[PDB]
Each structure stands twice: as structure tokens, then as C-alpha cells.
């Protein structure tokens, strides 16, 4: 598959700053995708933050994200968001993108999506 993804937007914060995260798609429309955020720390190799269903219209998330966070999508531009407030130290984290292309759904198991970006760091200071 020819499908590549490039997110960006990361970078150094103080807590309680915002970012917002952004990924490019390329090689394939998202229209009929669901798309998911992940985040890697030594812990966790990619735990679930986010997820969208293919026209925007319902989400789920983490846990500890819940209330934080909100994504979003853009079809058109091909593009996925993470909207991120609230930025606290445990935040810290190398966030990817992903693609869900099952048609069943969201769903929150890093090994049911594809296409992986190299992710983008994000630094919350103490």
C-alpha cells in the first residue's frame, strides 16, 4: 500500500499549555477510514488516545485524555487533528497516527490500524 502519513505539531510546553496536532495523509482519501491517535512512552508502546469515525460525527478516547482532548477531521484536506488542552508532565509522549479501515466501527487496539506515521514529539514541562 502506497498510503503514507505525516503528523506534526508537537513540541515543548509548560503544563496546562495546549497543542494542536495535526497528520497529512497521502496516497489514498480518508473518506471512508476511521482515524486514531496513539502515544509511546517507555510504558507504552502505543496507547490509545483517540479515535474518529470516517464522517467526524462520533469519537472515543482514553481515559486519561477524556475531557482533554477533542479530535477532529478534515476529508477534503485529507487531514486528521488532536486538540490538546490541559497539557500535564505524564502527557509527554510520541504521538502517531493511524488508519482503521475495517468498517466496524471505532475501536481502541493499537494492532487494528495501519499505516503508521513516524509520529511527532510532544514535551510537557513540569
Known amino acids: 500500500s502506497q498510503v503514507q502519513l505525516v503528523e506534526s505539531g508537537g513540541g515543548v510546553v509548560q503544563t496546562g499549555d495546549s497543542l494542536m496536532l495535526s497528520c497529512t495523509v497521502s496516497?489514498?482519501?480518508?473518506?471512508?477510514?476511521?482515524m486514531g491517535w496513539f502515544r509511546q512512552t517507555p510504558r507504552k508502546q502505543r496507547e490509545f488516545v483517540a479515535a474518529?469515525?470516517?464522517?467526524?460525527?462520533?469519537?472515543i478516547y482514553g481515559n486519561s485524555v477524556k475531557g482533554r482532548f477533542t479530535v477532529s477531521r478534515d476529508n477534503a484536506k485529507n487531514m486528521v487533528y488532536l486538540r490538546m488542552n490541559s497539557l500535564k508532565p505524564e502527557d509527554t509522549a510520541v504521538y502517531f497516527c493511524?488508519?482503521?479501515?475495517?468498517?466496524?466501527?471505532?475501536?481502541?487496539?493499537?494492532?487494528?490500524?495501519?499505516?503508521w506515521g513516524q509520529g511527532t514529539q510532544v514535551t510537557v514541562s513540569s
Open positions: 493511524a488508519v482503521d479501515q475495517l468498517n466496524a466501527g471505532l475501536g481502541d487496539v493499537s494492532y487494528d490500524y495501519d499505516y
Open positions: 474518529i469515525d470516517k464522517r467526524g460525527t462520533g469519537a
Open positions: 496516497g489514498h482519501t480518508i473518506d471512508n477510514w476511521a
